[PDB]
Amino acid sequence: PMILGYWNVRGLTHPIRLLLEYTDSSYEEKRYAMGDAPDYDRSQWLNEKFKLGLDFPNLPYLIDGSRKITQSNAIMRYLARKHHLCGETEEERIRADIVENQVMDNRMQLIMLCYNPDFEKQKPEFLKTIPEKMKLYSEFLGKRPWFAGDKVTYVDFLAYDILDQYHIFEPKCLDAFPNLKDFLARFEGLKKISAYMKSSRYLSTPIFSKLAQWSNK
Amino acid sequence: PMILGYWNVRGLTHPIRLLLEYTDSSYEEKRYAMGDAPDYDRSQWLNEKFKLGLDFPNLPYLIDGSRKITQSNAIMRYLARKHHLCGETEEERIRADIVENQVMDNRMQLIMLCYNPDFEKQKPEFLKTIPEKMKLYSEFLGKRPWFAGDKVTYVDFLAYDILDQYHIFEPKCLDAFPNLKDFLARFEGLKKISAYMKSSRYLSTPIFSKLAQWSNK
Ligand SMILES: N[C@@H](CCC(=O)N[C@@H](CSC1C([N+](=O)[O-])=CC([N+](=O)[O-])C=C1[N+](=O)[O-])C(=O)NCC(=O)O)C(=O)O
Numbered sequence: 566p567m568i569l570g571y572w573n574v575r576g577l578t579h580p581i582r583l584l585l586e587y588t589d590s591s592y593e594e595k596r597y598a599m600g601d602a603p604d605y606d607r608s609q610w611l612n613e614k615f616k617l618g619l620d621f622p623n624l625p626y627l628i629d630g631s632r633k634i635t636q637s638n639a640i641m642r643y644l645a646r647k648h649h650l651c652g653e654t655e656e657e658r659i660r661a662d663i664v665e666n667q668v669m670d671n672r673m674q675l676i677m678l679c680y681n682p683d684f685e686k687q688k689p690e691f692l693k694t695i696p697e698k699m700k701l702y703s704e705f706l707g708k709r710p711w712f713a714g715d716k717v718t719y720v721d722f723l724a725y726d727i728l729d730q731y732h733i734f735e736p737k738c739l740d741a742f743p744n745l746k747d748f749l750a751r752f753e754g755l756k757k758i759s760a761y762m763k764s765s766r767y768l769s770t771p772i773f774s775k776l777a778q779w780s781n782k
Numbered sequence: 783p784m785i786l787g788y789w790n791v792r793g794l795t796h797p798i799r800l801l802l803e804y805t806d807s808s809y810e811e812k813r814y815a816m817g818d819a820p821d822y823d824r825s826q827w828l829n830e831k832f833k834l835g836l837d838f839p840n841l842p843y844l845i846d847g848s849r850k851i852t853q854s855n856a857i858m859r860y861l862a863r864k865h866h867l868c869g870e871t872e873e874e875r876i877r878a879d880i881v882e883n884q885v886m887d888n889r890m891q892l893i894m895l896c897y898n899p900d901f902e903k904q905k906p907e908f909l910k911t912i913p914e915k916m917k918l919y920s921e922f923l924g925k926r927p928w929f930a931g932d933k934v935t936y937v938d939f940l941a942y943d944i945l946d947q948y949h950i951f952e953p954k955c956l957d958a959f960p961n962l963k964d965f966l967a968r969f970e971g972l973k974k975i976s977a978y979m980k981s982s983r984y985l986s987t988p989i990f991s992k993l994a995q996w997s998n999k
């Protein structure tokens with residue numbers, strides 16, 4: 566079958582695990598483990614990093630037949646074209662492009678705060694930024710069921726992931742944005758997703774490696 | 783015409799400026815200025831950030847009639863679809879997807895170093911990593927004329943950009959990689975690109991904003 570390689574953490578791979586399940590893909594995962602302090606051994610991965618035939622070795626990676634992919638975004642796009650989950654019109658392609666990129670920005674901001682020493686120091690004023698962030702997602706979605714338009718597309722997986730994580734970090738961040746709470750419920754409600762969330766393969770936490778100062782266990 | 787907005791710096795908008803030129807697009811630019819230390823005034827931009835009808839306001843932005851786009855990669859993809867500068871087969875689409883994302887990673891690494899107050903003590907370690915990055919690109923391109931195949935695509939613009947920047951940072955980083963030097967020479971040899979490089983509109987440095995520790999002047 567297909568192989569998905571990544572750390573045994575949620576990280577930036579929730580989107581991909583969710584889509585593999587949504588599309589009924591025949592897959593197996595390799596979940597590499599990092600060592601505990603002081604050093605935090607990464608050898609399980611390092612030992613084969615440069616032996617997989619990957620062009621730009623990294624985690625996550627996807628092996629599908631003779632195809633070998635890296636870059637989480639690229640994996641998502643690959644799967645999308647494979648299972649017809651892309652925007653159909655120009656308006657839909659545009660919305661998809663922006664959200665994909667925007668999610669990435671929001672993800673990096675989070676990691677930056679969380680992989681900061683005085684994690685506790687910032688959270689305050691960081692929770693300060695959440696509303697305007699959420700408001701932008703809210704207004705962009707509006708009354709549509711999915712982010713690109715009339716059908717579910719790969720970007721809803723990305724948007725589900727980030728809205729979920731901010732929801733973890735700041736549990737009240739969504740009270741002011743009902744269409745966002747409804748979108749989380751609608752996504753969580755897709756048949757194949759619901760079933761996966763009760764499964765043994767489900768890995769909602771931790772999000773970051775023991776390394777961070779939040780969701781690190 | 784089309785309107786492109788961004789800082790009066792190279793930053794991450796070079797690929798867009800180059801593609802606008804390559805496609806013979808009618809466009810105008812707004813090059814926003816930042817004040818120097820210690821406050822580094824951003825009002826020129828802050829004064830209209832929320833007044834352009836953008837969904838997730840940011841720099842760069844592209845306004846094209848009714849269409850308003852943010853996120854540098856979505857701006858690139860929009861120009862590529864309009865101008866048929868995308869891959870035509872699954873193989874080309876994969877290679878483009880990988881490269882678009884790899885670029886961003888390598889770009890982010892440069893920035894993290896360049897905005898670090900510890901730049902000078904930091905630099906030696908960064909320098910050590912250059913050869914490995916360059917090798918990956920070299921081996922990926924191989925004997926192909928362009929990154930995604932036998933034809934120029936929008937990813938050549940991003941690759942060009944990042945390889946040039948690393949070459950500026952460390953002049954000898956391409957010596958070991960002839961195919962890389964040749965790619966730089968070939969890209970710069972395109973009729974609309976040589977022409978632009980001599981125009982009043984060309985901006986190659988400063989690379990970063992005034993906050994930076996290098997190429998910030
Ligand atoms: N993911 C976005 C990130 C865009 C972004 O962060 N824009 C920055 C400038 S880019 C910045 C940069 N610079 O300006 O010197 C250069 C850079 N680079 O060389 O790669 C990276 C930057 N960055 O902050 O990410 C900005 O000031 N936005 C306006 C706002 O927040 O109100 C994109 O690709 O467009």
Ligand SMILES: N[C@@H](CCC(=O)N[C@@H](CS[C@H]1C([N+](=O)[O-])=C[C@@H]([N+](=O)[O-])C=C1[N+](=O)[O-])C(=O)NCC(=O)O)C(=O)O
Binds near residue numbers: 638
């Ligand atoms: N742009 C690449 C980034 C891949 C990357 O940096 N991979 C990290 C893990 S992701 C890391 C992360 N984490 O592992 O907890 C979580 C994260 N996130 O939650 O957003 C971001 C990560 N990061 O370092 O960028 C890694 O360990 N690569 C193997 C190597 O360097 O040899 C992609 O989208 O796939």
